Ligand binder design. Structure first.
Ligand SMILES: *[C@](O)(C(=O)NCc1ccccc1)[C@H](C[C@@H]1CCNC1=O)NC(=O)[C@@H]1[C@@H]2[C@H](CN1C(=O)[C@@H](NC(=O)NC(C)(C)C)C(C)(C)C)C2(C)C
Ligand SMILES: *[C@](O)(C(=O)NCc1ccccc1)[C@H](C[C@@H]1CCNC1=O)NC(=O)[C@@H]1[C@@H]2[C@H](CN1C(=O)[C@@H](NC(=O)NC(C)(C)C)C(C)(C)C)C2(C)C
Lengths: 300, 300
């Protein structure tokens, strides 16, 4: 039993973390096969096209540990630089590039100067920021999920917002959210609480013997969503309810019943009590998260 | 900026996770060099000596993925079984066996059937339990810290306590805490809050722009420790204060001043406000944790 924020094993990803240096900028790059993906502002209100047409191959330094990789070509796909080198990465896994929806989670392998520093779990917030742990030097660390043997790369860090959250891109270059890799006024946008995730975590709670929050009451998804509005919670769809099925099945608590509990928590608070060792309703646990952790799915 | 519970990169440890099967028991083993460390109750109020004198080499199945390892010898060092095999692990890192003190943290690579499932961060509580995330099949997963290039293995899981926390051993076999690998009445013992860690996390808070908890007041380590008693907090030693130095230095907040803040939080609570996104005073962050994360120390 027990329930922790759990990263995926970071090992298949460490094998791909290289250093990318160009001029006075050093950040992290992701070497997959013979291509090194890094954030394009390594070439730095700029005009990266003009700034790239503009460099030569030999301007790009690529350390892979103690091995210097020669770039034999480069392109720019949206906000990522794709530096083609002359060595395929022997440690290249089975991998996907995917793009996540807000609500969903992934593992971040914070790197600096190409060396892995740590791994933790994040969520794509509603406002498309991620509450991360990024310092100067971190740019080019990747978010990712592991599926059997497949790494789904879904994030590259680029930048931090004045509120201390972070913004970045899928590995095909495209910013999650309205942000841009230009140092100009950009505001996160009001965040909301991922309701489907909070229920999943309440299910994680029941599965682990935590029952202090339950009640006999039920509610209809409509009038629950009236109170999820006021508490600035994501409306719950029936599609969220379907997903919650397995968890509702395991525990014999109807998804709607759990909503009536979450309702009452929002209307009263937790009153000195914790759930799964938090005094907050936690929302960076997808339902799939709970099932993985409350059933121990592995990866070879 | 930002601040997360951050595991070490789990890659050097994944390389060592093998499956160990004996009779009707399958758990996880740690293959380092030509020796496979696993929990001794894989041979199962027993008498493991009688139970071991007792098996032969060929009784022990050792999968390393799709490669079956032959045991050529076995011994029992305290509560761990050391199965000598005929193949040294090509992926063996620089590593230590160490034993941690209560208060300190490490990364746990939850494995099942030899395959890594996830990685999260733990603390050795005061009562020498760890609040983990362990299911049937998990036994033999290891806790560990990474130091430059060196893995300090400090934990192997053996068992869960009726309260849902976990107990285990250093890799030399010895139970942290009064627990024993016998299914008999064993109680955790009252837990306490790791005060030195809570301050470190408050320092992590200041470093990240969180100041809502500070005040002009100071206190003497003596009369602080009077209130740390009542709130069931570890007494703070001057030695803890010395450790907090660097963090107190970075922020210009005297360790004692921070204690006066922690005092006031305990005497009032957080009053609807969070620190570093928690409504609880967090204590599984050592000072070294904060400095690593608030300065980005890596590992090659
Ligand atoms: C990232 O590039 C990095 O880690 N690089 C290290 C580096 C070495 C040598 C030369 C240059 C960079 C860096 C990561 C940031 C910094 C700390 N944590 C982070 O998330 N990104 C970065 O500096 C981006 C990059 C510039 C400005 N920038 C920022 O994140 C800005 N933030 C903003 O300006 N955001 C606004 C536009 C206000 C919304 C700060 C935080 C550095 C000021 C790009 C192109 C946006
Ligand atoms: C651990 O052995 C494991 O993961 N093995 C899987 C396995 C496969 C095939 C055959 C046997 C085991 C297992 C891990 C536990 C179970 C779920 N989470 C865990 O932490 N340990 C385990 O079962 C130990 C082992 C027996 C009893 N035991 C327990 O943890 C007990 N707990 C206690 O009995 N603890 C007391 C003594 C009450 C304080 C339970 C939880 C299974 C009942 C050993 C030798 C103690």
């Amino acid at each position: 039993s027990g329930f922790r924020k759990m990263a995926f094993p970071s090992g298949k990803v460490e094998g791909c973390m290289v250093q990318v240096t160009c001029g006075t900028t050093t950040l992290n790059g992701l070497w997959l096969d013979d291509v090194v993906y890094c954030p394009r502002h390594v070439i730095c209100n700029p005009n990266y096209e003009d700034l790239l047409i503009r460099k030569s191959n030999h301007n790009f330094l690529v350390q892979a540990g103690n091995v210097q990789l020669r770039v034999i070509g480069h392109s720019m796909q949206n906000c990522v630089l794709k530096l083609k080198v002359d060595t395929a990465n022997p440690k290249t896994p089975k991998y996907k590039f995917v793009r996540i929806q807000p609500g969903q989670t992934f593992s971040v392998l914070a790197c600096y100067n190409g060396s892995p520093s740590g791994v933790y779990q994040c969520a794509m917030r509603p406002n498309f920021t991620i509450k991360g742990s990024f310092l100067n030097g971190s740019c080019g660390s990747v978010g990712f999920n592991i599926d059997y043997d497949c790494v789904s790369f879904c994030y590259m860090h680029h930048m931090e917002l004045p509120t201390g959250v972070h913004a970045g891109t899928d590995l095909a270059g495209n910013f999650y959210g309205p942000f841009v890799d230009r140092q100009t006024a950009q505001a996160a946008g009001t965040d909301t609480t991922i309701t489907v995730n909070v229920l999943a975590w309440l299910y994680a709670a029941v599965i682990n013997g935590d029952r202090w929050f339950l009640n006999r009451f039920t509610t209809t998804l409509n009038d629950f969503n009236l109170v999820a509005m006021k508490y600035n919670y994501e409306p719950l769809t029936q599609d969220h309810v379907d997903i919650l099925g397995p968890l509702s099945a395991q525990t014999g608590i109807a998804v709607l019943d759990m909503c009536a509990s979450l309702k009452e928590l929002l209307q009263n608070g937790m009153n000195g009590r914790t759930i799964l060792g938090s005094a907050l309703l936690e929302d960076e646990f997808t339902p799939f998260d709970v099932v993985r952790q409350c059933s121990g799915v592995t990866f070879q």
